[PDB]
Write a protein that binds this DNA or RNA. Structure first.
Lengths: 150, 82, 75, 116, 136, 182
RNA sequence: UCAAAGCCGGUCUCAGUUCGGAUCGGGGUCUGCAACUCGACCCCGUGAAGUCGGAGUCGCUAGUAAUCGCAGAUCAGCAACGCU
């Protein structure tokens, strides 16, 4: 917890900074921190969803810069299809043979729009290494939707 | 407790740390190790990170907690259940 | 309401003790269940019942941490 | 529960009857009845009304009673403690705030028993 | 396979295979569609296989609608049994499809792949059918 | 003649005050107190209908009228309820008894309930008809307090000719209702 | 000038009580650099369970058991209702 993520506080060292599951603020974007009432410093981003409700609590906040390069990443997932009939559902394993991934936002549904929606997890949180895996994961020939998940 | 004649107890370290924060009107967090130093009506806004037994524990002081000893906001033990 | 169906009513006198406020109203407390205390009021005579607090006496809206604590504590 | 100056709080001596109020014990009853001119050895059946009026106005001027006092207590707990103080955490989890053995006997707060 | 949550009458007469369709004769949902030219009872299996055939011939992209629900039961007596002893129990769920009735609809960018997908579906279907357009 | 206090006060000053606060084109558009109803819904009478008689006695000694015993419209498995059984004692009050009961209520009972921090002015149905409720009966001096074995509250509603909560609130506060400022 | 139970008198009149005192709110004192975790004591308020305790079980033969208070060690302070 306090070993990798958190070493950016201006005031003084020692950290109880936790990365709340709001927007994945681990990339070096405009962020801030809210002293979590009972639980530390929830670090949130500028374009976060529940940012207005936190700014409503405008006293319990403090400056943060957050460029601790040697650390880990929160991770982000993408929308990618499967097919469900004997090909192009094992393409997920074909294209996971070239990348290991943890589960983020999976969901199987096929009485839907014209695909077996199988929104695909990922382990890619890099600025300039997105289209690469988005090409590796684009074998099905019907790749229309490609944007990531927030 | 803490007889009024003796007045409130605040470790001088935290005092010299916070009085300068007042007179320069900056409110960066204060890494003060000792907890035990009664909150006085001088730093409602400044945040302390008192308990160093095992965690950072920031605490933003308010009007509502003056006089209370700063360690009340920094539980040392941990219990979630069985 | 009908004659026997209903309880008995009579103009009685509401007396406040806090203010001496003085109302007259018909009540179920009557010759059956009044405080046995008559007085004249107007061109007739009525029994009393007494009240502890009234709309005139009662302190309601008609008629009515802590840095300050710690500063009167520690100067 | 219905009246501050319950016209019959209970038929018994005044010193002990006035203690049937959330902000009155034996000594407050005694000092009240001393500040007034009311005997303490007298039952409530033997009361008057003017006695009740002087008691009511004395009390409402000097000290606190059921509703306002109970609200003061609960507001003290919630607000003045907070969400997440220590005594507040332990109020929340239903345990003895002032420092006590939780290991064996904190039953007055913890409840009768939840033996597993 | 489509199926209703309930029916007030589980055992029903066979739907009358007569008359040209008065409703669902047009698209109203998408761009390209399957229109029927024969009378037939179209079943769950047929509908699902045709939907699947579309969804496999073309993938993520575009949308599909099924303008018929098979809510009409068709019973089946057990096998190796005599006539009589009551009406059979429901086995199949169908939709009475008169000519003109549009059965499947889709919206997809390329007319070629759309029409070909619909052709796959029609070949899954038991009837002579037709490609139709929202435009005319 | 011998009009009720509250009623002579009403048609002497309150009507004009309401006209001023709401300039009414017609005098007959003035708000007026139609009736007040005291319900004493006692759902605890289903298991034993012996509490209804105490409810009856209480409402009678309060208002001055034998109540109407409201038989249940419907049977409810959860509330232990059949149809037709005595759940509730209702009293409708109109005219002189209404004005007298309102004066008694305002000037006696509401300051007699414990910790009376006011009555909510939001408690209007949307047509200038107020309704509040009580948790007991000792607030009415008409009852002997020693004879109160079971607390029995009530729902008092004051229905008026007002066409909105604003005019209703004006009328009630003019009559002297304790509407706390919220 | 050490008690307490005790003795005399008064009151309460069998009630969850003027029993019980926990717990909790507030206000304090003392110790100590310092009483948040984590002290004792005081005051005001609160006034929980508990109506003599299932199976079972313990100590005691006389200045004993039962009860009453007192002192000491450790100790700044006390969590001592313990121990001697």
């Amino acid at each position: 917890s306090n070993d990798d993520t958190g070493v950016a506080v201006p005031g003084a060292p020692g950290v109880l900074t936790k990365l709340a599951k709001c927007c994945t603020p681990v990339p070096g974007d405009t962020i801030m921190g809210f002293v979590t009432r009972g639980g530390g410093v929830s670090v949130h981003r500028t374009d976060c969803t529940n940012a207005e409700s936190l700014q409503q609590q405008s006293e319990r906040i403090i400056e943060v810069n957050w460029a601790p390069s040697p650390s880990s990443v929160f991770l982000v997932a993408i929308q990618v299809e499967a097919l469900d009939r004997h090909r192009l559902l094992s393409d997920v394993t074909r294209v996971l043979a070239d990348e290991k991934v943890n589960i983020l936002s999976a969901s199987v549904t096929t009485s839907n729009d014209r695909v077996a929606i199988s929104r695909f997890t990922f382990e890619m949180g890099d600025p300039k290494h997105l289209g690469h895996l988005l090409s590796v994961v684009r074998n099905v020939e019907g790749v229309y939707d490609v944007y990531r998940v927030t | 407790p803490r007889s009024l004649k003796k007045g409130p107890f605040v470790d001088d370290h935290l005092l010299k740390k916070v009085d300068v924060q007042n007179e320069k009107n900056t409110k960066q967090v204060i890494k003060t190790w000792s907890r035990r130093s009664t909150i006085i009506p001088d730093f409602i806004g400044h945040t302390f990170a008192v308990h160093d037994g095992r965690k950072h524990v920031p605490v933003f002081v308010t009007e509502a907690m003056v006089g209370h000893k700063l360690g009340e906001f920094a539980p040392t033990r941990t219990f979630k259940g069985h | 309401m009908k004659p026997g169906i209903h309880p008995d009513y009579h103009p009685v006198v509401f007396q406040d003790a806090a203010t001496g406020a003085q109302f007259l109203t018909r009540s179920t407390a009557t010759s059956t269940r009044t405080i046995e205390w008559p007085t004249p009021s107007g061109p007739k005579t009525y029994p009393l019942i007494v009240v502890d607090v009234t709309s005139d006496s009662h302190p309601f809206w008609t008629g009515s941490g802590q840095v300050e604590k710690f500063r009167r504590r520690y100067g | 529960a219905r009246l501050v100056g319950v016209d019959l709080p209970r038929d018994k001596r005044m010193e002990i009857a006035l203690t049937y109020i959330y902000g009155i014990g034996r000594t407050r009853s005694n000092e009240i009845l001393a500040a007034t001119g009311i005997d303490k050895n007298m039952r409530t059946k033997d009361l008057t009304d003017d006695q009740v009026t002087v008691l009511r106005d004395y009390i409402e001027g000097n000290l606190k009673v059921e509703g306002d006092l109970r609200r003061e207590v609960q507001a003290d707990i919630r607000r003045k403690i907070e969400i997440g103080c220590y005594q507040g955490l332990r109020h929340r989890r239903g345990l003895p705030v002032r420092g006590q053995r939780t290991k064996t006997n904190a039953r007055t707060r913890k409840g009768p028993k939840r033996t597993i | 396979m489509l199926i209703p949550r309930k029916v007030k009458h589980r055992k029903q007469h066979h739907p009358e295979q007569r008359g040209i369709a008065s409703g669902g004769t047009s698209v109203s949902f998408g761009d390209y569609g399957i229109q029927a030219l024969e009378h037939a009872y179209i079943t769950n299996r047929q509908i699902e296989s045709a939907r699947i055939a579309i969804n496999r011939h073309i993938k993520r992209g575009g949308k599909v609608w099924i303008n018929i629900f098979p809510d009409r039961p068709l019973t089946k007596k057990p096998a190796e049994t005599r006539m009589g002893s009551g009406k059979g129990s429901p086995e199949w769920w169908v939709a009475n499809v008169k000519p003109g009735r549009v059965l499947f609809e889709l919206s997809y960018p390329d007319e070629k792949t759309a029409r070909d997908a619909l052709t796959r579906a029609i070949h899954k279907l038991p009837i002579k059918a037709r490609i139709v357009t929202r435009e005319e | 003649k011998a009009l009720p206090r509250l009623k002579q006060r009403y048609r002497e000053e309150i009507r004009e005050a309401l006209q001023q606060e709401f300039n009414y084109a017609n005098v007959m558009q003035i708000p007026g107190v139609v009736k007040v109803v005291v319900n004493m819904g006692v759902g605890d009478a289903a298991r034993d209908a012996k509490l209804i008689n105490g409810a009856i006695n209480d409402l009678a000694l309060i208002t001055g009228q034998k109540p109407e015993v409201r038989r249940a419209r419907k049977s409810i498995a959860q509330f232990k309820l059949r149809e037709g059984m005595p759940i509730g004692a209702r009293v409708t009050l109109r005219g002189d008894r209404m004005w007298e009961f309102l004066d008694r209520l305002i000037s006696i009972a509401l300051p007699r309930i414990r910790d009376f921090r006011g009555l909510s002015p939001k408690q209007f149905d949307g047509t200038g008809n107020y309704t509040f409720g009580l948790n007991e009966q000792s607030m009415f001096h008409e009852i002997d307090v020693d004879s109160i074995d079971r607390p029995r509250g009530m729902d008092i509603t004051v229905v008026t000719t007002a066409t909105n909560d604003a005019e209703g609130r004006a009328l009630l506060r003019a009559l002297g209702f304790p509407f706390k400022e919220n």
